[PDB]
Specification:
299 residues, seven-stranded antiparallel sheet, binds 3,5,7,3',4'-pentahydroxyflavone, 3C-like proteinase nsp5, cell invasion
Length: 299
């Protein structure tokens, strides 16, 4: 029993984190085989042209430190918004890995790092506006987000910068930004967010599985009539695919998805009136159906 914001064990990723120093900038890099990946804005600099700036760089400008052993850069290249530093040593601790891009609403673990040394791990969700509400201080650029499947690390996020509202923006590991953001000094701001409906529903199911049932009712809505109240409260539309994905949770609790939707509709119209769900007085939207199954069945 119990439900917590659970990150993946971080050990496979800890052994890939290095410090990259160039100019007066120090940030974090991801060392896999003989390549170190880091944000390109580490390059020594109003509206930088990074292809130009990278031409003016030499391999010896980049200081890479794995713990205490220093790594010598033998080549360098740009890959969209990340820099790839070729080094003369393949990382003996390179895990089985792949680079995947995630979808808004999906979750990952974040290994917050400073000067190449890991400092903490937490669970994040890609917000529908392609930001993440992380916890990041100066020096944390290059910290990575990841999921683990069996023994394979799926890297999905490299941190690049904090937006004025205090939320965070980064790239996938091929250097492509999540959302309409750029690694140059703009007045760019996060766009309006919405609540991930399918996640709230999965968390309602987690609550039922854990004995919280005070919000249940006998009523059942239809997809169309639920999506109309969703729109009013700034909730993402719910699709038939979402209902199918919720099927296993439906089965295990014996509550149909559209039944649980009627209860969600009630929680939006009325409040909770001083009650809580899973220790929360808010509707929680950063647990996917997959995370619930993992924590409420097999981990
Ligand atoms: O976080 C940000 C940041 O660091 C800087 C920046 C740019 C050039 C520099 O030479 C520098 O030292 C800092 O630009 C930004 C521009 C944005 O639109 C949003 C941001 O969040 C940042």
């Amino acid at each position: 029993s119990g439900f917590r914001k659970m990150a993946f064990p971080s050990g496979k990723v800890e052994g890939c984190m290095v410090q990259v120093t160039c100019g007066t900038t120090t940030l974090n890099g991801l060392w896999l085989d003989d390549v170190v990946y880091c944000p390109r804005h580490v390059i020594c600099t109003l509206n930088p042209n990074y292809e130009d700036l990278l031409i003016r760089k030499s391999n010896h400008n980049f200081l890479v430190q794995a713990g205490n052993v220093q790594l010598r850069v033998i080549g360098h290249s740009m890959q969209n918004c990340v820099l790839k530093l070729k080094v003369d040593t393949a990382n003996p601790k390179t895990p089985k890995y792949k680079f995947v891009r995630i979808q808004p609403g999906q979750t990952f673990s974040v290994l917050a790092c400073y000067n190449g040394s890991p400092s903490g791990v937490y669970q994040c969700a890609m917000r529908p506006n392609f930001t993440i509400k992380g916890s990041f201080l100066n020096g944390s650029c290059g910290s990575v987000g990841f999921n683990i499947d069996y023994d394979c690390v799926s890297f999905c996020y490299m941190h690049h910068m904090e937006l004025p509202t205090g939320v965070h923006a980064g790239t996938d590991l091929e250097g492509n930004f999540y959302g309409p953001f750029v690694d140059r000094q703009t007045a760019q701001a996060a766009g309006t967010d919405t609540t991930i409906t399918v996640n709230v529903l999965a968390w309602l199911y987690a609550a039922v599985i854990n004995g919280d049932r005070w919000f249940l009712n006998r009523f059942t809505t239809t997809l169309n009539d639920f999506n109309l109240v969703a729109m009013k409260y700034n909730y993402e539309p719910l699709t038939q695919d979402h209902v199918d994905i919720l099927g296993p949770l439906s089965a295990q609790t014996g509550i149909a998805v559209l039944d649980m939707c009627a209860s969600l509709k009630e929680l939006l119209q009325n409040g909770m009136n001083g009650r809580t769900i899973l220790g929360s007085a808010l509707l929680e939207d950063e647990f996917t159906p997959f995370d619930v199954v993992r924590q409420c069945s097999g981990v």
